């Protein structure tokens, strides 16, 4: 479905045919894959849209083949779609951190709570599972079962028919072991025909218990449909995140992610199995890559990334030490290369662990002391020297150089 993409990339990336007659087969195949992945259609043509707009105005950077630069846009774009920023802060803030699980029946609301509280235990916190799973008694059994199998306490008194009480009772008790994190799996009713039921039972819990985080589990089988419940969810609790489970037992995954994002919700994790370890933090970008191209996008990453005087000094010298292993460097300079056994002189320069003490002292300096250094004194000079590892001599040389250039450009 959506996995057929890397190939569509491994082709577009093997000088298959002419540049433009290739761009299209991709767009054909991308749309095919996306839609075939259950991503909403209006979104797909939309995307390809903002993709042809960029191929238009955006101008290709150096060391960027007509096509690689291309993918840089694809990736970027597929990337905005599924995420749009960096990995959320699955890391708790205040202690204790409290988490509620509002999973619609069949959504693995419970398996996830386990899988999740193991996530955190395994990462070093003192997790506590509160079984407010009222609408399901079988959830109780199965819960404490996997619970004991992982060394986690699970408060709960069956048939209380009132979870909000179970919550306050159970969370206020998990402040005893000074537990760091508390996972409150709130009962999820209305099976599949949910409507607005759980949202009400929710705004309630939030008001009564008032926890630090609220996460609505979604079955990755719901395709782009997930957009409705998700949207009502975000609306209800603009301060919460979605977890999408069973990602691996469907071909309509993309539809859910793209979907849930469409609304504005955040996807902190994604279930990928029945097992307990089957749950990993959702890294939007790494996902787009994981699908576009293994690391092919990686090379594209290096290349694009690294790429009145002491200022330019740093920015300048910095981009130079970075460099990058390739012969396209001279593609910038109006000169045609002749032989290659020569650059081995460059690998050798990088040989000495420490390549330049200049970027070292330039770092050991204030961002102002980098501007007007004629204020630098001998005390300031041994300070910046010892701080960098250099000697007052390696630094005097440095300073004299900035000015000789200060004077030289004056002489032009």
């Amino acid at each position: 479905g959506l996995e057929n993409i890397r190939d569509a990339v491994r082709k577009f990336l093997t000088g298959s045919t002419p540049y433009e007659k290739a761009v299209d087969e991709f767009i054909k195949d991308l749309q095919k894959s996306l839609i075939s992945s259950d991503v909403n259609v209006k979104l797909v043509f939309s995307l390809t849209a903002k993709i042809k707009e960029r191929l238009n105005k955006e101008k290709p950077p150096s060391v960027l083949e007509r096509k690689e630069w291309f993918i840089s846009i694809v990736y970027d774009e597929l990337s905005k779609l599924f995420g749009g920023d960096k990995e959320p802060n699955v890391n708790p803030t205040k202690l204790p951190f409290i988490i509620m699980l509002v999973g619609v029946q069949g959504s693995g609301k419970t398996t996830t709570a386990g899988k999740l509280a193991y996530f955190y235990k395994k990462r070093g916190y003192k997790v506590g599972l509160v079984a407010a799973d009222v609408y399901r008694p079988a959830a109780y059994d199965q819960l404490l079962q996997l619970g004991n199998q992982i060394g986690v306490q699970v408060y709960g008194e069956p048939n209380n028919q009132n979870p909000i009480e179970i919550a306050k009772k159970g969370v206020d008790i998990f402040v005893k072991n000074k537990m760091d994190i508390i996972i409150v799996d709130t009962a999820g009713r209305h099976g599949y025909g949910e409507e607005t039921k759980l949202l009400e039972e929710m705004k309630e819990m939030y008001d009564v218990l008032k926890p630090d985080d609220v996460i609505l589990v979604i079955d990755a089988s719901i395709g782009q449909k997930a957009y409705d419940l998700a949207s009502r969810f975000h609306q209800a609790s603009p301060i919460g995140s979605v977890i999408i489970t069973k990602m691996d037992g469907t071909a309509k995954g993309g539809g859910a992610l793209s979907a849930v994002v469409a609304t504005g919700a955040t996807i902190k994790f994604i279930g990928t199995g029945e097992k307990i370890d089957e749950l990993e933090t959702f890294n939007a970008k790494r996902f787009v890559s994981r699908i576009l191209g293994m690391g092919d996008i990686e090379s594209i990453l290096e290349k694009v990334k690294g790429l009145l005087t002491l200022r330019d000094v740093y920015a300048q010298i910095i981009a130079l030490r970075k460099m990058g292993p390739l012969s396209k460097v001279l593609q910038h300079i109006p000169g045609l290369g002749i032989m290659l056994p020569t650059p081995s002189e460059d690998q050798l320069k990088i040989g000495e662990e420490k390549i330049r003490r200049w970027l070292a002292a330039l770092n050991s300096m204030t961002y102002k002391e980098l501007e007007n250094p004629n204020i630098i004194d001998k005390s300031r000079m041994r300070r910046i020297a010892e701080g960098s590892g250099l000697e007052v001599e390696e630094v005097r040389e440095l300073l004299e150089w900035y000015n000789n250039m200060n004077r030289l450009l004056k002489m032009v």
Binding site: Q316, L320, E397, L409
Partner: peptide, 20 residues
Amino acid sequence: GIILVLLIWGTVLLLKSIPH
């Protein structure tokens, strides 16, 4: 552009002050 091919350029002329 040539500006740096001079500045970043004429540096090694006396890269001699270095330790041993």
